[PDB]
């Protein structure tokens, strides 16, 4: 349907998959990384009804489905379900055949090896894609943001990777990776709202809480002052409409959940928080690198859309940083949608045509080729 | 010798082209049944021989 064998770009995370073609500005479609399955016995006959549902089908029919995510903390653990998600992504909504297009997939630099290897195998064996590449999330964010140097703090649904990059090169000894993510904030919000009389323990309830989080929650610039008021007055509560007509209001819980990014102890995690790890990613780099990383804190990934987060991340690191020097945050309206955007940019670069793995080299090496050719 | 190389190459390509046609046919057959199931969804409530005996008897 395209006038060129443009690469397909699929930003497959632990949240939603954003997909479209290289050279465009935006994904053609977005899909929950979900395969749904009925938890009930059918009663009426000739009702259609699938054994399993994929993406938005799984979410739309969720009233009686248990919903599973094949990707956890950035890694595919269930590749049969990813084959279904990709079939849907490519043939039902983008309506393209990867057999005629190179495909670009994304991951964090320390994502366990099985992820990129199974992603490579699925696209070469079930879709028979002519070429593959698995790209770095930080690289993709840097292209989207217009930078070659900076800290990419990618606090999304799966993991926070936090990798410093200088002149387009990794500074791997300074990756302050953290097992704290948007999915934990969602789990925390389900629990804290349960305490308000609105229990959220089932799949339908979990999807509702994620929707509540995305629309009602924030981190603010000053937690203690924000809570001093939110805990004292109803003036800071915000309502939300649930699908069945219930109305829930959230007070200080509205920010106490999200605050776990700065205070991980709220969910039992042992961590300094995302702002200290951002600071250390800069500090652990050489002294002649530090000045450029301080001036370029690059925000990407999920959770970047919480009110007060860009302002707060700059405040928290500038407060740890030395005086005289200027410390700055980069947080464009392209935040979180930067990995997909970077995929489009990267896939299309003329210099990247030497990075793509072809369905030639693949057959001689097998999917393990991804560890020889990508990064 | 060039022709032998050409016939060998053309059948390799031919297999893939036939497979591509087969894949689109398969998608039509699958889409067609989904449409038929949806058709039944709305036609079913009236597929009866009705209200004849009501007056005859």
């Amino acid at each position: 349907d395209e006038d060129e064998t443009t690469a397909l770009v699929c930003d497959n995370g632990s949240g939603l998959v954003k997909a479209g073609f290289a050279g465009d500005d935006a994904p053609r479609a977005v899909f929950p990384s979900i395969v749904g399955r009925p938890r009930h016995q059918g009663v009426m006959v000739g009702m259609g009804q699938k054994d399993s549902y994929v993406g938005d089908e799984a979410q739309s029919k969720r009233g009686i489905l248990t919903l599973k995510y094949p990707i956890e903390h950035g890694i595919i653990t269930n590749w049969d379900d990813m084959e279904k998600i990709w079939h849907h992504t490519f043939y039902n909504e983008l309506r393209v055949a990867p057999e005629e297009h190179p495909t670009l997939l994304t991951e964090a630099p320390l994502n366990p090896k099985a992820n990129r290897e199974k992603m490579t195998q699925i696209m070469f064996e079930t879709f028979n894609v002519p070429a593959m590449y698995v790209a770095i999330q930080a690289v993709l964010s840097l292209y989207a943001s217009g930078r070659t140097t900076g800290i990419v703090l990618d606090s999304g649904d799966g993991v926070t990777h936090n990798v410093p990059i200088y002149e387009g090169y990794a500074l791997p000894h300074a990756i302050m990776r953290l097992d704290l993510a948007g999915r934990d904030l969602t789990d925390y919000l389900m629990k804290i709202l349960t305490e308000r009389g609105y229990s959220f323990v089932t799949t339908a309830e979990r999807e509702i809480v994620r929707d509540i989080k995305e629309k009602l929650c924030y981190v603010a610039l000053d937690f203690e002052n924000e809570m001093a008021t939110a805990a004292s007055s109803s003036s800071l509560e915000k309502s939300y409409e649930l699908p069945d007509g219930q109305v829930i209001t959230i007070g200080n819980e509205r920010f106490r959940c999200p605050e776990t990014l700065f205070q991980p102890s709220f969910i039992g995690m042992e961590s300094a928080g995302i702002h200290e790890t951002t600071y250390n990613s800069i500090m652990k780099c050489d002294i002649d690198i530090r000045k450029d990383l301080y001036a370029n804190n690059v925000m990407s990934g999920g959770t970047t859309m919480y009110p007060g987060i860009a302002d707060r991340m700059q405040k928290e690191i500038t407060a740890l940083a030395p005086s005289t020097m200027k410390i700055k945050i980069i947080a464009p309206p392209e935040r979180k949608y930067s990995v997909w955007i970077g995929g489009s940019i990267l896939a299309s670069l003329s210099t990247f045509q030497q990075m793509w793995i072809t369905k030639q080299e693949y057959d001689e090496a097998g999917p393990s080729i991804v560890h020889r050719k990508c990064f | 010798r060039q022709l032998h190389a050409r016939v060998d190459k053309v059948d390799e390509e031919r297999y893939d082209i036939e497979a591509k046609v087969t894949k689109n046919i398969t998608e039509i057959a699958d889409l067609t049944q989904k449409i038929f199931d949806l058709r039944g969804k709305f036609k079913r409530p009236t597929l009866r021989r009705v209200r004849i005996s009501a007056d005859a008897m």
């Binding site: 195998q121 028979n128 369905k359 057959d363 | 390799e12 297999y15 893939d16």
Partner: peptide, 14 residues
């Protein structure tokens, strides 16, 4: 002290 692609590759070549 005591692969799905290998299958398709073979089909087209055979």
């Amino acid at each position: 002290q005591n692969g799905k692609r290998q299958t398709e590759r073979e089909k087209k070549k055979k």
